[PDB]
């Protein structure tokens, strides 16, 4: 349409312009009009005819003559053939391709400037009315205003692009330069374009449109052209006003974070279809039970296979087989219907915090098997096995509408305590929690190297391998193989001017503080200054998008391709008018556009929809409260630590909260720009949770962290326990009364004093362990002052105090054989009142020494439910879910038959029953559950009966029978013993005994006639029952003096005796009960023969129950007789009336027979002795003290028992009488003649029993424990004497006084000798194996190695027991079972080592070759454990491999001094005679036991062996000296091995001397008492 006016050129001007005959016609012959006049208000008609001028000169001069015309004979198109091509003499560019683009460009500035004069004058009628935006851009240009959208002024700027082509074209009058008309066409394609695109919308369209206005200055000035110096300004004000300050780096970070999305129209929509699926999949998930995992675990791959299939843009069997899935969900929806017991979501917490540990890219696996029975949903599991993920996954699962979890023990708390409080639950939940529990111990065992590893320096790794690939983009080149200096000089290489300032301000301190970070706090700040980095590199200010610029590429192409063919068509309708049907030169001439050249049009796709709205909202919230001053604030305030510090964290986890859940449903269409910033509003949020998880772990008033149980590396270690009690002193004493919570934890440490095996480290965690028990009872009296249980009615600080004394017994035990599987499920309670009661303790990291026992805590209840007691009282689960299934299948058969009859009242009554009957806790007792299966059986007889034949319940009634005659077999076992439960019940009387004896005994060894008095109370004011828990209780106390030790031996003194002398009494107790138990055992088994069924008829079993309860009360309330009688009636009555075997010291030669050359080689012997001399005068000596024979005296008062036998028992006492007198007086006047002979302030010791067992001396020594065999049998009837006692008694009492006093004074000299006796005794042994010794004494060396074999003696064999326990646990779970093996023969190994340890007393110096082989065996141990730590679990080895890393001249003066103290204490003992029973032999034998014992002087010669053994054990010799000393000690050891056999002597003579005479004390004074009763 320019070439029909181009091939309308009739000479001159088509008859010279007619006068309008196209208006003569009167629109497609007026606007051709138009573009005539406009080229002729140009020069372009005037410059073509200069043109012409030589081809007109040369047409008129070769030709005819003629008359001349203004303009040729020629058209317009001048570039065909025919000499005008010879006109290009000058201009040469008629040839070139810029000759039919002069032509068409002025058509195209014409419909383009005429197309802004429409624009223009439309300003001036409305305003703000239905009005385009490119003509409210001409409201600041006109009068018309309007109230906004002045930020672009896009008709200012494509008005100058037109103006500067219409002053360029009017007076160049060149038309020849470097392809200019070719470079005029694009401009004036991309000017129609800017006009399309700016009709209403699109800002964010016009950042291609200054960069095609940009590269085509680029693309003029490359072919230099002279063109592009004369505007240089159509752009330079552009990019002014429209230019970008905030993020440059989004164009250039996009291209590489981008993962897939869907590319056409109707991908979305069916994308949107999926999850709209995935939704409804989350609600029917949450209510199958654990039978039905093998179909949904399906159901979480199809959605795999369809995310898969939406991004592969296939869509022919999509809308096929999302029907099988709605299909499969209402498959599964309809038995979601039909459960009665609705599942209880439990363990909720547990499997979503095995999530957090696990959920990454890599480990896909072990979430999936985590997936369905958890609370996370189906549309974020899909992006973990596809890798279409963005952003670390953690981020995704923390924030809820739980950063504590994930770095604390949090998780490991919260196990045990769900599984202590698991049996307090109701009776549906007993089949769903065993099958809960177990799929949790195989989620543990699964997941267990990603519990153990560390949290805090792996978060570090997933920043450097994050933070280092944003500089590998910007910076060319690889950011770990330069330097400091070498990546700050690429900056302003690759990057702009603004991107720099931020890059060394926020990344690069991002970087430093990464790699120095130590603690949560320096990891925290390193990870917020990452944060607000990104955002002033990724958000704009005015809206930028990079994926606009791939959609105007291609519809510029649209256009420029629309033109070319429509240049194409309107000039072929001119090849039929001066043409042939060929070829014409200008159809070469013109560019005809390619179809094959689409510059890659789709990426993401992006509809009309305008992308403007969205970049305002985002600087309308991160200018709101994310900005840099907004975020700087809460940095300043943490560091300070001021005020109100958490409570602007919360209203800003809340505002990103709603603004990233507006962006999500936001939009409906594209995600890129969305979910890369959503990583970055994420990843600020962790930024402040590493600084609640530091300023927690700042507070701590308690530095002791819950778990410190349940794990056997804090527990074995004896300073660790005692610096867990100092800590701990701010709970104990300022704690209120009645809280049973403190006395729970005291329970604890009085475990722990047992299981170190009483050790003097602990002491002093026993004995103010016990103080502050006692404080809590002087408190709690302060403010006082101020069918078992059924029919006896009818005519928990008791439990707390009663479990406070069998621990204190249960300590002072032989031996324990101590493990750690019974020691930590006393463990598992503690942390639930140490997690509850006491807050601000310490965060922590999990570890393998907790792991281990909080598997062995489930493992220990979910066996107890599956394997297999005391009536009406026991639980039984194993029992209980045995008629839990007895009666589902009961109430499955009435539902069937209810649906058609359902008015009827037994169907309706039995089954509200059964309902009742499940919905029982596991607390209850048989007997209530009894009574549910008796009335559901009466039910179901009865409608038996009414009913047809065709019921066939007859399989249902014989097994409730069956199971109802099962349980009256387990009533009849509690018939039949029903005493142990009795004598129980007087043993929970001990918790109010251990107080009452706590205040006599400890505080006054914090007095001994005090003692005394207050203990023959407590035995005294007593019953039969309760009187051996008594004996077995003032045991308890005896040793808890011995384990003082010898601080004070008085207060060990007066509690020996008295236990011994009540201890006396014990077998006439013991005959009075085991007699009466035989008139009632017999009466209670003739009622349980009685009570047995033929012919079963269960309604009347329950008739023969109740006759048999009533009966059995009274036989309980008789037995309560004999134990409630007093015991104060035996203890009065005294003994009834026949003498005992010893423990008969005698070992003599045994070291007598390396002694003859040991005299030989003996350096100052000569200074100031024999051995032939005095070794035989001292054996000869020994003969004549074993020669004495002392006469007994038991022997004169048996005969005196005998004579009055037979003149008492021969008088038949009928009114012979004064024979029988005179008789009577002669054996009363010869016994008191009798002992007046032999021998015979005394009354101020004697007044009563409770004065002379004050003031006496124990025989607290294990030889002579027989000696007192008759001393206390004088102690019953001494108040029985002073009764009844007519001179010869006042005589005879008189007499028996003096025979006591010297019977009293002889237990202490003697007591001391044996206490003398047995220190000798243990030093003999020691100095005879020393004699046998080969190598040196190494005691300075070789003792500190002893420990550490001793220390490895009592737990190391113990640690092997617990650790083939849980990988017999883990055996159940996994494969891994053959690693027990190198544990047991790691353990009998060891058995062949702590024997040779132990063999010896004294050490030798072989010792040590054989030390070194026990170390060897320790790293030859550590080797087999870490090569077995392979294919299979870790956390079992790792606490035994911690444990053991953690745990890894004048001696001769000395044995002179002793030889000279050695024959003057035996020279004295001869110096007085021997003399073998004439007169006078009771007040020199007593005498004579008196001397011998004194003149040996055994507290000094015991003395001076004492100092002589130290001189050998505490310091040590080498291999000289050490023959010499040796050639000592056996130079007087057979003299040490005669004064041993001294002792022998002395000690066995005066023993039975002693059992002897007291033995006759008791034959006299029974006689005397018999005489003043009779």
Same mark, same amino acid.
């Given at each position: 349409?320019?070439?029909?006016?181009?091939?309308?050129?009739?000479?001159?001007?088509?008859?010279?312009?007619?006068?309008?005959?196209?208006?003569?016609?009167?629109?497609?012959?007026?606007?051709?009009?138009?573009?005539?006049?406009?080229?002729?208000?140009?020069?372009?008609?005037?410059?073509?005819?200069?043109?012409?001028?030589?081809?007109?000169?040369?047409?008129?001069?070769?030709?005819?003559?003629?008359?001349?015309?203004?303009?040729?004979?020629?058209?317009?198109?001048?570039?065909?053939?025919?000499?005008?091509?010879?006109?290009?003499?000058?201009?040469?560019?008629?040839?070139?391709?810029?000759?039919?683009?002069?032509?068409?460009?002025?058509?195209?500035?014409?419909?383009?400037?005429?197309?802004?004069?429409?624009?223009?004058?439309?300003?001036?009628?409305?305003?703000?009315?239905?009005?385009?935006?490119?003509?409210?851009?001409?409201?600041?240009?006109?009068?018309?205003?309007?109230?906004?959208?002045?930020?672009?002024?896009?008709?200012?700027?494509?008005?100058?692009?037109?103006?500067?082509?219409?002053?360029?074209?009017?007076?160049?009058?060149?038309?020849?330069?470097?392809?200019?008309?070719?470079?005029?066409?694009?401009?004036?394609?991309?000017?129609?374009?800017?006009?399309?695109?700016?009709?209403?919308?699109?800002?964010?369209?016009?950042?291609?449109?200054?960069?095609?206005?940009?590269?085509?200055?680029?693309?003029?000035?490359?072919?230099?052209?002279?063109?592009?110096?004369?505007?240089?300004?159509?752009?330079?004000?552009?990019?002014?006003?429209?230019?970008?300050?905030?993020?440059?780096?989004?164009?250039?970070?996009?291209?590489?974070?981008?993962?897939?999305?869907?590319?056409? !129209?109707?991908?979305?929509?069916?994308?949107?279809?999926?999850?709209?699926?995935?939704?409804?999949?989350?609600?029917?998930?949450?209510?199958?039970?654990?039978?039905?995992?093998?179909?949904?675990?399906?159901?979480?791959?199809?959605?795999?296979?369809?995310?898969?299939?939406?991004?592969?843009?296939?869509?022919?069997?999509?809308?096929?087989?999302?029907?099988?899935?709605?299909?499969?969900?209402?498959?599964?929806?309809?038995?979601?219907?039909?459960?009665?017991?609705?599942?209880?979501?439990?363990?909720? #917490?547990?499997?979503?915090?095995?999530?957090?540990?696990?959920?990454?890219?890599?480990?896909?696996?072990?979430?999936?098997?985590?997936?369905?029975?958890?609370?996370?949903?189906?549309?974020?599991?899909?992006?973990?096995?596809?890798?279409?993920?963005?952003?670390?996954?953690?981020?995704?699962?923390?924030?809820?509408?739980?950063?504590?979890?994930?770095?604390?023990?949090?998780?490991?708390?919260?196990?045990?305590?769900?599984?202590?409080?698991?049996?307090?639950?109701?009776?549906?939940?007993?089949?769903?929690?065993?099958?809960?529990?177990?799929?949790?111990?195989?989620?543990?065992?699964?997941?267990?190297?990603?519990?153990?590893?560390?949290?805090?320096?792996?978060?570090?790794?997933?920043?450097?391998?994050?933070?280092?690939?944003?500089?590998?983009?910007?910076?060319?080149?690889?950011?770990?193989?330069?330097?400091?200096?070498?990546?700050?000089?690429?900056?302003?290489?690759?990057?702009?001017?603004?991107?720099?300032?931020?890059?060394?301000?926020?990344?690069?301190?991002?970087? #430093?503080?990464?790699?120095?970070?130590?603690?949560?706090?320096?990891?925290?700040?390193?990870?917020?200054?990452?944060?607000?980095?990104?955002?002033?590199?990724?958000?704009?200010?005015?809206?930028?998008?990079?994926?606009?610029?791939?959609?105007?590429?291609?519809?510029?192409?649209?256009?420029?391709?629309?033109?070319?063919?429509?240049?194409?068509?309107?000039?072929?309708?001119?090849?039929?008018?001066?043409?042939?049907?060929?070829?014409?030169?200008?159809?070469?001439?013109?560019?005809?556009?390619?179809?094959?050249?689409?510059?890659?049009?789709?990426?993401?796709?992006?509809?009309?929809?305008?992308?403007?709205?969205?970049?305002?909202?985002?600087?309308?919230?991160?200018?709101?409260?994310?900005?840099?001053?907004?975020?700087?604030?809460?940095?300043?305030?943490?560091?300070?630590?001021?005020?109100?510090?958490?409570?602007?964290?919360?209203?800003?986890?809340?505002?990103?909260?709603?603004?990233?859940?507006?962006?999500?449903?936001?939009?409906?269409?594209?995600?890129?720009?969305? #979910?890369?910033?959503?990583?970055?509003?994420?990843?600020?949020?962790?930024?402040?949770?590493?600084?609640?998880?530091?300023?927690?772990?700042?507070?701590?008033?308690?530095?002791?962290?819950?778990?410190?149980?349940?794990?056997?590396?804090?527990?074995?270690?004896?300073?660790?326990?005692?610096?867990?009690?100092?800590?701990?002193?701010?709970?104990?004493?300022?704690?209120?009364?009645?809280?049973?919570?403190?006395?729970?934890?005291?329970?604890?440490?009085?475990?722990?004093?047992?299981?170190?095996?009483?050790?003097?480290?602990?002491?002093?965690?026993?004995?103010?362990?016990?103080?502050?028990?006692?404080?809590?009872?002087?408190?709690?009296?302060?403010?006082?002052?101020?069918?078992?249980?059924?029919?006896?009615?009818?005519?928990?600080?008791?439990?707390?105090?009663?479990?406070?004394?069998?621990?204190?017994?249960?300590?002072?035990?032989?031996?324990?054989?101590?493990?750690?599987?019974?020691?930590?499920?006393?463990?598992?309670?503690?942390?639930?009142?140490?997690?509850?009661?006491?807050?601000?303790?310490?965060?922590?990291?999990?570890?393998?020494?907790?792991?281990?026992?909080?598997?062995?805590?489930?493992?220990?209840?979910?066996?107890?439910?599956?394997?297999?007691? #005391?009536?009406?009282?026991?639980?039984?689960?194993?029992?209980?879910?045995?008629?839990?299934?007895?009666?589902?299948?009961?109430?499955?058969?009435?539902?069937?038959?209810?649906?058609?009859?359902?008015?009827?009242?037994?169907?309706?009554?039995?089954?509200?029953?059964?309902?009742?009957?499940?919905?029982?806790?596991?607390?209850?007792?048989?007997?209530?559950?009894?009574?549910?299966?008796?009335?559901?059986?009466?039910?179901?007889?009865?409608?038996?009966?009414?009913?047809?034949?065709?019921?066939?319940?007859?399989?249902?009634?014989?097994?409730?029978?069956?199971?109802?005659?099962?349980?009256?077999?387990?009533?009849?076992?509690?018939?039949?013993?029903?005493?142990?439960?009795?004598?129980?019940?007087?043993?929970?009387?001990?918790?109010?005994?251990?107080?009452?004896?706590?205040?006599?005994?400890?505080?006054?060894?914090?007095?001994?006639?005090?003692?005394?008095?207050?203990?023959?109370?407590?035995?005294?004011?007593?019953?039969?029952?309760?009187?051996?828990?008594?004996?077995?209780?003032?045991?308890?106390?005896?040793?808890?003096?011995?384990?003082?030790?010898?601080?004070?031996?008085?207060?060990?003194?007066?509690?020996?005796?008295?236990?011994?002398?009540?201890?006396?009494?014990?077998?006439?107790?013991?005959?009075?009960?085991?007699?009466?138990?035989?008139?009632?055992?017999?009466?209670?088994?003739?009622?349980?023969?009685?009570?047995?069924?033929?012919?079963?008829?269960?309604?009347?079993?329950?008739?023969?129950?109740?006759?048999?309860?009533?009966?059995?009360?009274?036989?309980?309330?008789?037995?309560?007789?004999?134990?409630?009688?007093?015991?104060?009636?035996?203890?009065?009555?005294?003994?009834?009336?026949?003498?005992?075997?010893?423990?008969?010291?005698?070992?003599?030669?045994?070291?007598?027979?390396?002694?003859?050359?040991?005299?030989?080689?003996?350096?100052?012997?000569?200074?100031?002795?024999?051995?032939?001399?005095?070794?035989?005068?001292?054996?000869?000596?020994?003969?004549?003290?074993?020669?004495?024979?002392?006469?007994?005296?038991?022997?004169?008062?048996?005969?005196?028992?005998?004579?009055?036998?037979?003149?008492?028992?021969?008088?038949?006492?009928?009114?012979?009488?004064?024979?029988?007198?005179?008789?009577? !007086?002669?054996?009363?006047?010869?016994?008191?003649?009798?002992?007046?002979?032999?021998?015979?302030?005394?009354?101020?010791?004697?007044?009563?029993?409770?004065?002379?067992?004050?003031?006496?001396?124990?025989?607290?020594?294990?030889?002579?424990?027989?000696?007192?065999?008759?001393?206390?049998?004088?102690?019953?009837?001494?108040?029985?004497?002073?009764?009844?006692?007519?001179?010869?008694?006042?005589?005879?009492?008189?007499?028996?006084?003096?025979?006591?006093?010297?019977?009293?004074?002889?237990?202490?000299?003697?007591?001391?000798?044996?206490?003398?006796?047995?220190?000798?005794?243990?030093?003999?042994?020691?100095?005879?194996?020393?004699?046998?010794?080969?190598?040196?004494?190494?005691?300075?060396?070789?003792?500190?190695?002893?420990?550490?074999?001793?220390?490895?003696?009592?737990?190391?064999?113990?640690?092997?027991?617990?650790?083939?326990?849980?990988?017999?646990?883990?055996?159940?779970?996994?494969?891994?079972?053959?690693?027990?093996?190198?544990?047991?023969?790691?353990?009998?190994?060891?058995?062949?080592?702590?024997?040779?340890?132990?063999? !010896?007393?004294?050490?030798?110096?072989?010792?040590?070759?054989?030390?070194?082989?026990?170390?060897?065996?320790?790293?030859?141990?550590?080797?087999?454990?870490?090569?077995?730590?392979?294919?299979?679990?870790?956390?079992?080895?790792?606490?035994?491999?911690?444990?053991?890393?953690?745990?890894?001249?004048?001696?001769?003066?000395?044995?002179?001094?002793?030889?000279?103290?050695?024959?003057?204490?035996?020279?004295?003992?001869?110096?007085?005679?021997?003399?073998?029973?004439?007169?006078?032999?009771?007040?020199?034998?007593?005498?004579?036991?008196?001397?011998?014992?004194?003149?040996?002087?055994?507290?000094?010669?015991?003395?001076?062996?004492?100092?002589?053994?130290?001189?050998?054990?505490?310091?040590?010799?080498?291999?000289?000296?050490?023959?010499?000393?040796?050639?000592?000690?056996?130079?007087?050891?057979?003299?040490?091995?005669?004064?041993?056999?001294?002792?022998?002597?002395?000690?066995?003579?005066?023993?039975?001397?002693?059992?002897?005479?007291?033995?006759?004390?008791?034959?006299?004074?029974?006689?005397?008492? !018999?005489?003043?009763?009779?």
């Amino acid at each position: 349409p320019i070439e029909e006016s181009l091939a309308a050129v009739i000479p001159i001007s088509h008859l010279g312009e007619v006068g309008k005959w196209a208006n003569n016609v009167l629109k497609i012959a007026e606007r051709l009009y138009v573009f005539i006049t406009f080229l002729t208000d140009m020069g372009v008609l005037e410059k073509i005819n200069n043109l012409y001028k030589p081809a007109n000169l040369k047409f008129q001069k070769a030709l005819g003559l003629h008359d001349k015309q203004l303009t040729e004979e020629t058209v317009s198109l001048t570039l065909n053939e025919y000499v005008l091509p010879t006109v290009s003499k000058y201009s040469d560019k008629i040839k070139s391709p810029e000759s039919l683009y002069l032509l068409s460009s002025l058509r195209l500035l014409l419909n383009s400037l005429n197309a802004l004069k429409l624009i223009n004058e439309k300003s001036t009628h409305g305003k703000i009315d239905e009005l385009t935006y490119i003509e409210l851009s001409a409201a600041a240009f006109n009068g018309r205003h309007l109230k906004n959208i002045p930020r672009i002024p896009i008709f200012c700027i494509l008005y100058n692009i037109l103006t500067v082509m219409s002053e360029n074209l009017k007076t160049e009058s060149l038309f020849c330069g470097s392809n200019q008309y070719q470079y005029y066409w694009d401009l004036l394609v991309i000017v129609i374009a800017a006009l399309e695109t700016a009709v209403t919308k699109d800002e964010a369209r016009l950042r291609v449109y200054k960069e095609l206005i940009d590269s085509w200055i680029a693309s003029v000035k490359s072919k230099s052209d002279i063109e592009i110096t004369p505007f240089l300004n159509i752009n330079l004000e552009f990019t002014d006003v429209l230019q970008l300050s905030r993020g440059h780096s989004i164009t250039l970070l996009w291209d590489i974070f981008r993962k897939n999305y869907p590319t056409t !129209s109707n991908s979305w929509l069916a994308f949107e279809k999926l999850i709209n699926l995935s939704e409804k999949f989350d609600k029917v998930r949450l209510l199958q039970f654990s039978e039905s995992y093998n179909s949904i675990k399906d159901l979480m791959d199809v959605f795999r296979l369809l995310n898969d299939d939406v991004l592969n843009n296939k869509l022919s069997e999509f809308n096929l087989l999302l029907s099988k899935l709605e299909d499969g969900i209402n498959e599964l929806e309809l038995i979601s219907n039909k459960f009665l017991n609705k599942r209880k979501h439990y363990f909720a #917490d547990e499997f979503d915090n095995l999530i957090r540990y696990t959920f990454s890219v890599d480990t896909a696996e072990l979430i999936k098997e985590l997936a369905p029975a958890s609370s996370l949903a189906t549309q974020k599991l899909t992006k973990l096995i596809t890798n279409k993920y963005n952003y670390p996954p953690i981020f995704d699962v923390l924030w809820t509408e739980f950063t504590s979890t994930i770095f604390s023990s949090q998780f490991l708390e919260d196990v045990v305590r769900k599984s202590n409080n698991l049996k307090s639950f109701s009776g549906n939940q007993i089949k769903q929690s065993i099958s809960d529990a177990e799929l949790l111990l195989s989620s543990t065992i699964k997941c267990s190297p990603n519990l153990l590893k560390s949290q805090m320096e792996y978060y570090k790794n997933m920043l450097l391998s994050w933070l280092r690939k944003v500089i590998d983009i910007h910076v060319g080149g690889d950011c770990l193989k330069l330097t400091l200096k070498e990546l700050c000089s690429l900056i302003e290489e690759k990057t702009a001017s603004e991107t720099r300032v931020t890059f060394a301000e926020y990344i690069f301190p991002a970087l #430093d503080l990464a790699e120095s970070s130590k603690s949560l706090e320096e990891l925290g700040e390193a990870w917020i200054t990452f944060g607000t980095g990104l955002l002033l590199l990724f958000v704009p200010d005015s809206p930028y998008d990079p994926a606009i610029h791939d959609y105007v590429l291609y519809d510029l192409f649209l256009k420029t391709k629309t033109f070319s063919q429509n240049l194409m068509k309107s000039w072929r309708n001119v090849r039929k008018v001066i043409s042939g049907d060929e070829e014409i030169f200008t159809e070469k001439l013109i560019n005809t556009i390619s179809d094959d050249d689409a510059p890659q049009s789709p990426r993401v796709y992006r509809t009309g929809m305008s992308i403007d709205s969205l970049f305002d909202e985002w600087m309308a919230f991160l200018s709101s409260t994310m900005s840099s001053r907004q975020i700087k604030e809460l940095v300043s305030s943490y560091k300070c630590n001021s005020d109100q510090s958490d409570r602007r964290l919360e209203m800003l986890q809340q505002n990103s909260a709603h603004f990233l859940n507006r962006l999500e449903s936001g939009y409906s269409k594209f995600a890129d720009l969305n #979910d890369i910033l959503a990583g970055y509003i994420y990843s600020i949020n962790f930024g402040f949770d590493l600084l609640k998880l530091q300023k927690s772990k700042d507070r701590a008033s308690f530095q002791i962290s819950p778990l410190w149980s349940m794990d056997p590396i804090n527990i074995s270690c004896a300073e660790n326990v005692l610096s867990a009690y100092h800590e701990l002193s701010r709970f104990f004493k300022k704690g209120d009364m009645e809280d049973t919570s403190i006395e729970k934890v005291l329970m604890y440490f009085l475990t722990l004093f047992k299981f170190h095996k009483r050790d003097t480290n602990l002491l002093e965690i026993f004995e103010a362990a016990l103080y502050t028990l006692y404080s809590r009872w002087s408190v709690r009296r302060f403010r006082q002052e101020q069918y078992e249980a059924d029919f006896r009615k009818l005519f928990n600080l008791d439990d707390i105090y009663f479990k406070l004394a069998d621990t204190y017994i249960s300590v002072f035990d032989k031996d324990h054989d101590a493990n750690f599987s019974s020691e930590l499920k006393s463990g598992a309670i503690i942390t639930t009142i140490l997690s509850e009661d006491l807050k601000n303790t310490r965060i922590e990291e999990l570890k393998s020494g907790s792991l281990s026992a909080v598997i062995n805590t489930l493992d220990a209840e979910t066996q107890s439910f599956k394997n297999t007691i #005391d009536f009406y009282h026991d639980f039984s689960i194993p029992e209980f879910q045995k008629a839990g299934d007895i009666i589902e299948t009961v109430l499955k058969s009435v539902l069937k038959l209810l649906k058609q009859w359902p008015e009827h009242a037994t169907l309706k009554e039995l089954y509200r029953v059964s309902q009742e009957f499940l919905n029982y806790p596991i607390k209850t007792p048989l007997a209530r559950q009894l009574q549910k299966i008796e009335q559901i059986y009466t039910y179901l007889a009865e409608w038996e009966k009414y009913a047809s034949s065709e019921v066939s319940l007859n399989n249902t009634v014989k097994l409730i029978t069956d199971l109802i005659v099962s349980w009256r077999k387990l009533e009849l076992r509690t018939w039949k013993g029903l005493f142990n439960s009795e004598d129980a019940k007087t043993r929970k009387s001990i918790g109010k005994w251990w107080f009452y004896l706590y205040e006599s005994i400890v505080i006054s060894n914090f007095n001994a006639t005090l003692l005394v008095s207050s203990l023959n109370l407590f035995f005294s004011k007593s019953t039969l029952g309760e009187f051996n828990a008594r004996l077995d209780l003032v045991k308890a106390f005896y040793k808890h003096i011995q384990l003082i030790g010898l601080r004070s031996s008085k207060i060990a003194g007066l509690l020996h005796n008295t236990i011994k002398f009540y201890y006396q009494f014990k077998p006439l107790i013991d005959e009075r009960i085991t007699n009466g138990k035989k008139s009632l055992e017999k009466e209670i088994d003739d009622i349980i023969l009685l009570a047995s069924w033929k012919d079963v008829n269960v309604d009347a079993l329950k008739q023969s129950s109740r006759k048999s309860h009533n009966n059995l009360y009274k036989i309980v309330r008789k037995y309560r007789d004999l134990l409630n009688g007093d015991a104060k009636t035996i203890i009065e009555a005294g003994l009834l009336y026949x003498x005992x075997x010893x423990x008969x010291x005698x070992x003599x030669x045994x070291x007598x027979x390396x002694x003859x050359x040991x005299x030989x080689x003996x350096x100052x012997x000569x200074x100031x002795r024999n051995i032939d001399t005095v070794a035989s005068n001292m054996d000869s000596y020994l003969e004549k003290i074993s020669s004495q024979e002392f006469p007994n005296f038991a022997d004169l008062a048996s005969d005196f028992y005998a004579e009055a036998e037979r003149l008492r028992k021969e008088t038949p006492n009928v009114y012979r009488l004064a024979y029988l007198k005179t008789q009577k !007086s002669k054996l009363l006047g010869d016994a008191l003649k009798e002992l007046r002979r032999i021998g015979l302030d005394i009354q101020k010791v004697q007044s009563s029993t409770t004065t002379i067992l004050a003031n006496i001396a124990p025989f607290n020594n294990e030889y002579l424990n027989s000696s007192d065999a008759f001393f206390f049998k004088i102690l019953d009837l001494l108040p029985k004497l002073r009764s009844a006692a007519v001179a010869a008694i006042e005589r005879g009492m008189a007499l028996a006084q003096s025979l006591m006093f010297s019977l009293i004074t002889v237990r202490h000299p003697l007591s001391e000798f044996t206490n003398d006796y047995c220190k000798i005794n243990g030093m003999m042994l020691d100095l005879e194996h020393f004699t046998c010794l080969k190598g040196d004494i190494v005691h300075s060396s070789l003792k500190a190695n002893v420990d550490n074999v001793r220390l490895f003696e009592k737990w190391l064999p113990s640690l092997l027991d617990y650790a083939a326990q849980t990988l017999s646990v883990i055996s159940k779970y996994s494969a891994t079972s053959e690693q027990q093996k190198i544990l047991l023969d790691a353990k009998s190994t060891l058995s062949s080592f702590f024997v040779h340890f132990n063999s !010896s007393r004294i050490f030798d110096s072989s010792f040590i070759e054989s030390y070194s082989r026990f170390e060897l065996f320790i790293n030859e141990l550590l080797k087999k454990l870490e090569n077995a730590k392979e294919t299979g679990n870790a956390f079992v080895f790792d606490i035994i491999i911690e444990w053991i890393k953690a745990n890894k001249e004048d001696v001769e003066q000395a044995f002179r001094r002793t030889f000279t103290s050695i024959i003057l204490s035996f020279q004295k003992v001869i110096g007085d005679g021997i003399e073998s029973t004439d007169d006078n032999w009771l007040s020199a034998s007593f005498k004579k036991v008196m001397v011998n014992v004194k003149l040996l002087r055994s507290s000094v010669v015991s003395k001076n062996i004492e100092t002589a053994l130290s001189l050998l054990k505490d310091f040590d010799f080498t291999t000289t000296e050490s023959i010499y000393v040796k050639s000592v000690i056996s130079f007087t050891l057979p003299v040490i091995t005669r004064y041993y056999n001294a002792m022998t002597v002395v000690l066995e003579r005066s023993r039975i001397y002693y059992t002897n005479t007291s033995r006759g004390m008791y034959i006299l004074s029974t006689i005397l008492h !018999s005489l003043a009763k009779n």
